[PDB]
Amino acid sequence: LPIRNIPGNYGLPIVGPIKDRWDYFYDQGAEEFFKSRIRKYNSTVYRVNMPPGAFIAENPQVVALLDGKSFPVLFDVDKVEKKDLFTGTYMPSTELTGGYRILSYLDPSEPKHEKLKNLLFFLLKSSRNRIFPEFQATYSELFDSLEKELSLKGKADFGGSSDGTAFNFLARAFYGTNPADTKLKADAPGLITKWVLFNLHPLLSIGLPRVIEEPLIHTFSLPPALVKSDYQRLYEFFLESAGEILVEADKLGISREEATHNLLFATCFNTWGGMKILFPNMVKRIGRAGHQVHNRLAEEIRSVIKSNGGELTMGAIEKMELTKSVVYECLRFEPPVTAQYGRAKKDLVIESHDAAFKVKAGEMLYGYQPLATRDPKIFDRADEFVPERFVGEEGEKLLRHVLWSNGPETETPTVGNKQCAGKDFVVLVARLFVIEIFRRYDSFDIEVGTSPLGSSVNFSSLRKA
Ligand code: HEM
């Protein structure tokens, strides 16, 4: 390929980054922010300023990688450093996380990265026999509540009940603990939401006027002191509930305190936060796919479960071709976590589709994942939600281009990489979610809005089997 100069610029000091931030949040929105510049520069690789800049991030300057050929450099731990960039060009105060740099912020070259990631692998494996029954019990109660609410109101707010369900499910599956039996009671979703906001506010908009938002959430960090007491309630829950897991932390040579802050983070931030975005998005996209698709899913799911003597098992799920494909298509079409960063460790030559580009050691690389996973040079019908996309031998080959987990779907998270520790768990619970819906309902209708993190979604009809 021809070597091209990386197009784009960072504009004026102070003023450049602020105007780019306004485009990003207000005047364009993330997707059009990136696409308008792809068009202008005639390039899927270019220089751009990223939020938050201001007083929160020291340096907003990045090289953006916006196609599925260039983007995977962000996975290569010999090319990029992945230290302290889980949230991008700033890092939330460690006062938010017990004074520890949590696993998500650690480069694989750090010894505690290996230890802590092994801890989470153990958490997931040891939970294996609890996931099915706890999912089916907690989500059954959720759909019961949504039916109740639909009968009362003519619509049922999915997110408003599902956030509690997801936390209860995780507490029961991971720690064999019902939060209703503890001091947390039903307060966890509110506590976690505030704490996550204190971490992520510089990257988020709530729809308030920019005159209010800019000074209040985009310029300076919210003080961690204001969420410390909330965080302490969560910590005491994890400390008291995670006994069996803490035994393994002891064996791995991790302090009880460090282990507990890490379990809190993986459970509340990575898992529950991830599910908070993913599940409503799934309900939205599957809802939009239409009743013929719903009927095909119901037919497949019910037939397979019947073939399996009414027992839902991992092997039965493997028979559910359309179900597996629809889950992968949700993750392709709308990756729940869209921003991945990496700092070049050495001089690199990054190949796009039609040119190569040279980046210097120390440059911050950034990828907006939906542009890599909806890349029309990789996927046909790239901007269409295609339920059956991954069905069959040929469809399955395309999984190497599904990147939700911060690596190819065909690859395995390891202590040597920064791929999502919960990769297999997420795909499993997403499948269980679709299964639970269509074993109960023939089809459904939705009403939808936006949310700081993804979508808000109401059911307006739930057609029982
Ligand atoms: C739908 C839910 C989830 C989504 C969308 C998601 C997505 C991601 C993404 C995109 C990253 C890469 C972060 C980066 O370096 O930019 C990541 C990392 C990580 N995730 Fe997940 N995740 C989810 C669930 C989980 C679960 C269930 C676990 C349970 C252990 C988990 C644990 C982690 C950990 C520990 C890392 C850092 C890995 C490392 O340091 O090597 N996540 N996740």
Curated annotation (Swiss-Prot):
(13S)-hydroperoxy-(9Z,11E)-octadecadienoate binds at N270, T338. CDD domains: CYP74 (cd11071). Heme b binds at K82, H113, K117, K418, C420. Keywords: Chloroplast, Fatty acid biosynthesis, Fatty acid metabolism, Heme, Iron, Lipid biosynthesis, Lipid metabolism, Lyase, Metal-binding, Oxylipin biosynthesis, Plastid, Transit peptide. Pathway: Lipid metabolism; oxylipin biosynthesis. One of its GO terms (cellular component) is chloroplast thylakoid membrane. Its EC number is 4.2.1.92. It catalyses: (13S)-hydroperoxy-(9Z,11E,15Z)-octadecatrienoate = (9Z,13S,15Z)-12,13-epoxyoctadeca-9,11,15-trienoate + H2O; (13S)-hydroperoxy-(9Z,11E)-octadecadienoate = (9Z,13S)-12,13-epoxyoctadeca-9,11-dienoate + H2O. InterPro entries: Cyt_P450 (IPR001128), Cyt_P450_sf (IPR036396). (13S)-hydroperoxy-(9Z,11E,15Z)-octadecatrienoate binds at N270, T338. It is found in: Plastid, Chloroplast, Plastoglobule. One of its GO terms (biological process) is response to fungus. The keyword Iron applies. It is an enzyme of class 4 (lyase). Induction: By wounding. Its cofactor is heme b. GO terms for molecular function: allene oxide synthase activity; heme binding; iron ion binding; monooxygenase activity; oxidoreductase activity, acting on paired donors, with incorporation or reduction of molecular oxygen; oxygen binding. Belongs to the cytochrome P450 family. Cytochrome P450 enzyme involved in the biosynthesis of oxylipin jasmonates, important phytohormones acting as growth regulators and signaling molecules for plant defense. Functions as an allene oxide synthase that converts hydroperoxy fatty acids to unstable allene epoxides. Catalyzes the dehydration of 13-HPOTE ((13S)-hydroperoxy-(9Z,11E,15Z)-octadecatrienoate), as well as 13-HPODE ((13S)-hydroperoxy-(9Z,11E)-octadecadienoate). This is Allene oxide synthase, chloroplastic.
